[PDB]
Amino acid sequence: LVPLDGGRFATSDLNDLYRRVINRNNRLKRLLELAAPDIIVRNEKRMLQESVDALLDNGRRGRAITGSNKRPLKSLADMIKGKQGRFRQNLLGKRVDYSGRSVITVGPYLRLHQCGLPKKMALELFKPFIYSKLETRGLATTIKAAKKMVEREEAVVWDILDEVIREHPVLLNRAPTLHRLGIQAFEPVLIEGKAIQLHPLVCAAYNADFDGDQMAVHVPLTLEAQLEARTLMMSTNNILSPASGDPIIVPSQDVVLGLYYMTREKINAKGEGMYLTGPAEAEKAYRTKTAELHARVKVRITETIKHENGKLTTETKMIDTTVGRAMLWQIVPKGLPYSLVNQKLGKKQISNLLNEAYRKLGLKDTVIFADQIMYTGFAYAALSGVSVGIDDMVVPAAKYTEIAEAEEEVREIQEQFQSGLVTAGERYNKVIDIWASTNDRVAKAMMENLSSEQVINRQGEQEKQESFNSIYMMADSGARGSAAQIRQLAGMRGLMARPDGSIIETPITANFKEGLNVLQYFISTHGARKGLADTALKTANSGYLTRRLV
């Protein structure tokens, strides 16, 4: 029972329950002292029993006793039990000191074991260490002087902070922590700002995107905790998924797009047919504007294989490849074949490269290779200039003809329905079937029109080339997008379902490039709301299942 600001007092309901019990017990004693009639004594004993039951467990015996808030009083059983009880709110989970929280940005310059930490935030977190080092070197005589210097933010305080966090690991955690990869150890690097800079390659581990996400930071204090963070929880050690064993630091989005663009092949490109001494000469040709990234050349490659028994065999041979493939081979560590890079590199190919590097070379080589891959992918995605435009969404000319044919035979079968040849259910089924078939045909036509182009080769004839469309490159590389989303963008949206689940006969015969009308948008919202609500409830279901399993 403690005073609040303004003279108000804050009390626990246990005080009210105890007061009720004491009052009823004293009344019972007084009644027994007065030689009371039996009925009053029985009533008082019933009231005493009810008060004790309410104090121990309110609401179990009968109507729950409520106070002046018209809300049941909280008893000891409620205090020890429940999601808000002591066990789950204060024993199995706690609020901790030496912790902070900030919005996360992307640091493309960071290494896999480094995280960007604000200077002020680190100053607040590492304050006792700063005091210790400010006294050790004699800059502050006592702890009060050190506190004053830290508060005044002197330059020597910044140097002390830089010396403190040099090899001190820090813990980064993002809610919810679905798996153990949601908490990792990094080496802090002081940055000017208020947002934590995070390595891109750990984002898939954190399930984190930079749209307003916040991350918490913790400071291990004892030597044991620091070594636990360095040895077990460091990001350089956690590059394999504990659920499957597959790599978890695989590149995505810009890195995959850049590695795909650089490793593509173009017909009759500048510098075609040239002979290059190696990756260095390929890079030299690219920087001198002699040859394009996608020019077919012959490159002398020195390639070393580390066999299963440990044999290291080096073979130098001339391989038909592209300039970009050799320039990417310039960063591939020794011990891997050139066939891993002598192809267009999607997400699957880069994942295979990283997995092979881990299986044949180890962890350090894999970490350096991943960092170099991310750097090269970012750089050449920037140099590519890939952009989305309204002309990149090419709607096939066969879509309108297919729609007209489907509508015509729908009219025909409606006429058949008026004749009684078929029932309503059969008509519904075949209308749905034809609309699915027409959607498939339109998607196939759009994909064929989007996946290929005709070019002129050296001899002057017309040759078949894979298209360089930005959306097609994004989908094929596996960076972002798929066939279905391209179908919605440039083909047909398809049949959609009613709120109960039934599929509407008339589908959305319009894509997002042409634009939907009011009815089609309403039908789309019908399913969008369902998806959002299903995600919201399934999150709680998965959380409960995970808690039970743990």
Partner: peptide, 10 residues
């Protein structure tokens, strides 16, 4: 049949 002490008192 009832759990309210008031009803029992009445």
């Amino acid at each position: 049949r009832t759990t309210d002490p008031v009803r029992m008192y009445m």
